[PDB]
Structure formats: structure tokens, C-alpha cells
Symmetry: C3
Amino acid sequence: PGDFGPPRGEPIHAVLTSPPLVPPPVNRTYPAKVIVELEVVEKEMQISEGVSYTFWTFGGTVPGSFIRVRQGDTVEFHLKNHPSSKMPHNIDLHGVTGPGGGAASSFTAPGHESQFTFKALNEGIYVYHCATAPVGMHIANGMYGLILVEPPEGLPKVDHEYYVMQGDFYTAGKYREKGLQPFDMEKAIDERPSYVLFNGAEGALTGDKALHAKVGETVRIFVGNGGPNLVSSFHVIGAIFDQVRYEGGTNVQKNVQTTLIPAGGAAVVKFTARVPGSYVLVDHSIFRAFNKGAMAILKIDGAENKLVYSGKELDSVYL
Amino acid sequence: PGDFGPPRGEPIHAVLTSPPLVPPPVNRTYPAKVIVELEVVEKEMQISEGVSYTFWTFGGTVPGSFIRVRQGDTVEFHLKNHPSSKMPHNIDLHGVTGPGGGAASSFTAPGHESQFTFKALNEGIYVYHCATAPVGMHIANGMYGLILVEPPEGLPKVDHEYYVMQGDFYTAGKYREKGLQPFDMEKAIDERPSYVLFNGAEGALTGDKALHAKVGETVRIFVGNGGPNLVSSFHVIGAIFDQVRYEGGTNVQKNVQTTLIPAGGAAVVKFTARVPGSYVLVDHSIFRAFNKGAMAILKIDGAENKLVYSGKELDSVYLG
Amino acid sequence: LPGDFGPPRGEPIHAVLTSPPLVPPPVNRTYPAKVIVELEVVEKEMQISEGVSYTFWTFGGTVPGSFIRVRQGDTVEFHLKNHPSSKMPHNIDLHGVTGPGGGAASSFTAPGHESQFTFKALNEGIYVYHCATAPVGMHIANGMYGLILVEPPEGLPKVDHEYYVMQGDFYTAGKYREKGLQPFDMEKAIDERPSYVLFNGAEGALTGDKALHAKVGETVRIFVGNGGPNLVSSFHVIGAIFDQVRYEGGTNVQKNVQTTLIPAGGAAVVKFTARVPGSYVLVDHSIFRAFNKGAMAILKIDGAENKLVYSGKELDSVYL
Ligand SMILES: O=N[O-]
Ligand SMILES: O=N[O-]
Ligand SMILES: [Cu+2]
Ligand SMILES: [Cu+2]
Ligand SMILES: [Cu+2]
Ligand SMILES: [Cu+2]
Ligand SMILES: [Cu+2]
């Protein structure tokens, strides 16, 4: 079970990436001791235009910092809780084998740092999240991210890797009602989200912050679903998934339009850019995408291929 | 990736089928140019007994006309919008590689026709739907269908193929409230459908409109889910799926009772009819099936096989 | 027909059914048998939560119902016994049955009656059974569901522990944890707004004294049903990773899965090895169900700490 022995070499200080970026491959044939530091920050951010929300974050972003390790690594986790935090936080990583996936070993009061160590026994793409009572509220405020545990051979090389995470959010106000929106427990219990978002905001991955790729380039997206409650009917408008690591497992389904991502679950999708234009990540529970903000953009630039996609060729009158 | 060369032979004028029928296998060894013509029609139809609804349709049905092509085919798509239409419409086919799955290239005003061409690069079974703002409304009014992209070698032969598509519907009125029912945007945004239906109506596939097969016949169902919002726990009462193309992909799960069909997704199920009687397609989120209309019938004709299924053999007094 | 091994051989087998969370032993058999299965329906008030009661409708006195274990190709002679204290008739649809209603049509049983019907278990798998008496949603919601395992001919790979767990959504007239005898609420059920989401028919059915157990080093197989009626489980074990999932209960496996979707009226099989001692939590990771509606069950692991795998908290320090 990832039995590649005791750690070797110098301890590696993991470099974490902010969404939507992914750390490079560990490019490593031996297990290492990997030191991971992650700081909780409670901060007001823009959930929608003119709409503020008090997010609780791992590394100041929703989703939180991406962590990349190799199956068989020993991970020395340091959870820091900023002095400015109103409350304690902890971490459950779905990649941990042990109680609370770390929750029991990571209670961190404001201004404190918890250290715990775990072996990454299983390859996969694992949701991590705060596991502080009430757990649903901590998740709903943005306390989730992904940790990639590579297989020992590493993943097949691609041109672009991206980090995207859906979440459902519960404001006291309705969708696009302006001002600082409190969290709404009643709506959260009833699974009636006001917003459904990729990367913590309407337009988090639109305009200048859109994902980018070129015609001919292979694209892998690690797609997390923090929930707390919703299951994503995950689709890219104008693309087909060549490969889906369905529910984030090792085995693949091929030629998929739309894949179900469980709440507190993940998937990996892979496809090749072939036509320039705007491609739209959506929850194909489609009112979420077009009426609650579940939309992110991948812009493809490069030469037109009119043999693959012509664009509109003729308009005519019809009786 | 569907690189079988330039289209060859005679240009094909696709014969589309109305649900629940499927066009025949393309039975071709070569990539072709396939001309597809599909007319949008807005029309009042019966959604339930004494209940009407203004459906928006590709080809006059919900779901829309079934399109069948081969991986590697160049599809020349003609979207016609009937002059009677109040709204413009377009089409996003999940089988299209490029912006909006064709939405960007298919804006069609009433009494207009849009032409756009694409290559079908990926085999699979793909939802198509209108992508006109508000997109959720156009889908909710029934603007969805399936396009089958065959592998180059074709699908394994079966006795029957059926076309079935779940949708969730949002009427101002409650379930079975009589009269012409408007669309309800509030129920749609809140994912609180008044009806969940196979093929656009309560009883669309019941009685004289049931699917049919005979004892001993292999059945393939292309099972679409137009949504807009619900995920189907898709089950056939009294059958087990020998094979499921889970999420409509190439690989297969075997021996599955109930398979989750994503909103804007599809599956293929295969089983063999062994025992005569009525088999019920349901959303096994079971209040949908028995209280909101999500039920369709497959009638199996032929000889009883009491060694597989006896029927009720005995009723006895029980004191317990 | 793979799964047809001809008619029963040897002496009839009187099946022993197990109450959750226990499973019958592997059958360990090389021939098709006539397996006589007897299952009694009992309607009874039970505690759904501390100081809250509910009138459950049960197969064999438990929610979920008694676990049935047979071999692919067995002839099952089913005896459904409805206790005369029952206020409703009941029947049974087993998702492992090939034929009308999965047996529902052959097992209509008035109070104080016994129905017999016979079927061949043609498909290996892990199948939901449930009552199919109108209103079907209500019979399921009152707890009439369980699992029947149809082993492959050679049996499943040996494990240290097999457990039986089944999620249900429940609809009370009152709110979550309001005390007293809670009526079924049909309006909440139709709206898919459960007051409780539970493992094995009650808050704490699988907590404290009733927790599951294994030892460090031991392989665990959990047969996870979802009776619904309406919800899909984002099924996770806090602190564990599924080495293998039989996704949607099918024969093929996915490897290294955190959270697997279990359809309404569906099932999965998860396998993992206990490596670290402590408390592991079965949840619906639609996580407000788990921590606000009671969708929480416990697996206690006992044995030697392994600090190389999980150290526990090593240091608390103060930082700016
Ligand atoms: O087969 N069950 O609804
Ligand atoms: O890891 N479960 O919330
Ligand atoms: Cu927290
Ligand atoms: Cu979790
Ligand atoms: Cu339209
Ligand atoms: Cu779509
Ligand atoms: Cu019953």
C-alpha cells in the first residue's frame, strides 16, 4: 500500500499553487519527507459584482492552495490559523489514512500552528476541507481544496494542468443582492444555495482570469466539488472529455460529455484543444450555470480549423 | 482522433427519427458528408390528461429528432426555425468540438435557416439542446435530443434500439392542475419541478405507445437526460442492465440495477428480455416516478418461462 | 445466459437471513440450489431519534430489511409473510429478479397472508429489494428496503469483515428531533425535503454500542444500499480511502476513490484495509445530511498505533 520504504534525500518544502494553477510534477523515483505549510485566513471577498462575503480560506483563496505529493511520501503537515481568525479551524484531507483524515490531529486556535505527520498510502485526487463543528458551515464558507497524490510513475505529461473546484454557497440575501451577505444556515440545511460557483466567485475564471490553452495542446483539469451539498453535472461547453478519472479513481471512462462529481469528491478530465474560441465549464444542472453563477471560461487561441468547426456558413429565409 | 481522412462517397441526407425510434446503423467503412436538417417548432401539446404546455421542439417532438452519424463524419447542419416561432433558437450538440457546440454558429430567427459544418471527432451518445438565453428556459420547454456518433466499426447488433429522454418540467400550476400551463422560472431556478417525464408527457410511453420487444430479444436504450436540473437514478422495473455505458462513455459497467444519468448527460443500457409482461422505466428517485410522472413502459410479448419467473404460485393464511 | 446452470441440484437450502449490519457467510457452493427464502413483514413503532418514534414498515423487523445471500443461477423460492398485525398489504420487488415488478406482481400479500413465487437469480450483483405497494414512495419511505447479494459462481474474494449498511431519506410531519410519534409527511416526500437522512433506519443505529468494528490490518467490505426513496448518497468514510469500489454495484471496480455516488434504489460495494486505530465515520458527503439530518454511522478500528502512517498531533506552537 504505497510501500516504497522510509523517506530519502533532504526534506522537501512543498511549493503550493493558488487556483487555478497546479504545482509541477514531483519528477521523483523515491519517497520523500514533504513539509506542507498552509495558513487559514478569514477575509471579506467579492462573491459577485457588488456582493461581499466573509470567506474562510486555506492560503487566502477558494478553493485553497493545491498540494502535490507522491504516493508513499511522508507528509509533515503544518496548519497555521492566522491571529486575525475569529475561530479555530482544522483540516480533513481525503488522502489521509487515519481519524478525521487529520481533523483529530489539527485543531488550531487563532494565532496557533498544529503539526501532524501522515503517509500518503493511495494515489488519487483528494478533497481537503475544514472539519470544525459545524463542518457544513466551515465548508460552505470556502474551507476546501485539492491534494494530488501522484502514482509512483507520475501522471502522463500534458501541456496544461488546471485546478477548478465547484461549491454551493448560502447567503441570507438572494442571488446578486448587493452588500455584505451573511452565511444562511437554514438555506444550507435545506440544500437551497443562492450561488453555485467555480473558484469562489461569479467571474473567478472569466475575462483576464479565464484559463488559457492553444489549439493542439492537451488539457488536464483537476475538478473538485467542495459542496457542501451539490453534485456537479460537470460539462465543458464545446469540448468532449477524451478521458475522465470518474470520481477521481485510477481507471478512466472515455468519450464523456458530462461527468457527475460527488459532494466532497473530485474528477480529472482530459481533452485536446482543436478549435479557437471560448469554452465554458458549467454545472449542467443548467439553472446553476446560467442563474446561480456556475460558469468558468477556457479561452483557446490559434488557427481556425473550418474542416472541424466551420462557424455559421449561411443564413436564409424559411417558409 | 477521428482522423479517417476527407469525407468520401455520396453525400448522405440523414433520416432523423421521432422518439422513441432510432435510425438504422449507418453500416459504413468510410467517412462521409452527412447533411442534417432540423426544424424548430413551438407548439401546445398535452403534458398530462387535460393539461397542455407550450413546448419548444426540434422536429415537433420532445425529445427532438434522433440524429445518427459515424465518428470521422463531416456534418453539414441546417437549423430551420418555423416562421410561427415567437423566439429565435440555436443548437449546442455535445458531440461538436468548438464554441457553444454550434450555438455561436446557429442563431436562427423565426422563418430563418442557419447552416454550420463540424467534424464528429468523438464516438459517443450526445445531448443536443437549444442554447438561446435564457438557456434554462429553452431546455425546460423541451429543446433537447440525442445525436449518436457510432464507433468506426459500428455498435454490436441488437434486436431493438429505443430512444428515451428524461426531462424535468416547471408549470405555474401544481402537478395535474388542468388547462394550458405556463413555464415557471421560479420553480426552475429552485429545481422544484411540477413534472419529471420520459419523452415530454405523462403516458408518452404507456398503453398503445409502450415500447415493445419479444422474449429472447436484446434491447439497447439510448437514455438521454435533458434536465434541465435533475439527475436520473435510471432503473427498469424487472430488468437488470447486463451492460451500461456509464455516463455514455465507451467503457462498460456490467450487472447494474440503477445508473445515474447526469443532467445534460446520457447512458446506454443493454439487457435481454426473458419473461413476458410490463417493464417500467423510472427515475428511481421514486416520488418522481410515481407522483410526478417519470414512468414509461416496455411490454415484452412471448412464452412464459416459469423456471426464470413463476408468477405468484400460492397464497396461504399466515398466523406469525 | 451466463448465470443459467440448469435446474436446482441436491437438497433444498433453507436460507438464513441476517439482520443489519451483519451479512450471511459466503455460500461456498459449486452447484445451483433451490434456496427457500422466508421474509416476514412487521409494521412497528421504533425510535428514529432520541425521544422521537416513527411507525416503520420492515422486512424481518429491521431497517434495512434482512440481508439475503444466494449464488448466481440459484432457483429462489420466495415466501413473503405479512404479519396479521399489519394495517397494509405489502409485496416485494427485488432488483435481482428478471420479470414483472422484480416479483412485485407475484407477491401481493394481505395482512395475515403468505405469498410464494419462484425466480432464477440470473445476474450476479448487489440488489436493492423494496416494497412496491401503492403508494410505492410511502412504503419505501417507511423503511421497506434491503439488499440481496447474488454471488458470482466462484464467490467474492475473501475479506476479514463484511458489513450491511443502507441509507434512506425519511419524511416526518414534525421537524428534525421534534419529540413524540412522528407521522409520515407525503408533501415533504414529494418535494424531496427529508427531515432525516439515516444509515440503518435511525440516528445512532450504528453509533456508540452499535458501532461497526474491525482491527488494524483487516480488510473490510461494506455492502452499501440506498433505499432512497429520493436522495443520491455522496458516500464517504471519514479517514478512509476506497481501494476498490464496485461503482453502482456493478462487477467492474474503480480504484482509489474518496467519495462514490450511490443512486436512489441503487447500491455500491466498497473495500478498504484498516491501517490506523480510531473512529471512522460513514457519511453522505452532501454534508448537511451527515451533520444536521443524522446521515452518520461509525466504524471503530482497534489495534496498534502506526505513527509512520498517522502520528497524531505532534506540536501546538504560537505564530504571528
Ligand atoms: O424497481 N423499483 O422501483
Ligand atoms: O470527510 N468528511 O467530511
Ligand atoms: Cu474552519
Ligand atoms: Cu470530507
Ligand atoms: Cu430555443
Ligand atoms: Cu449542454
Ligand atoms: Cu409495503
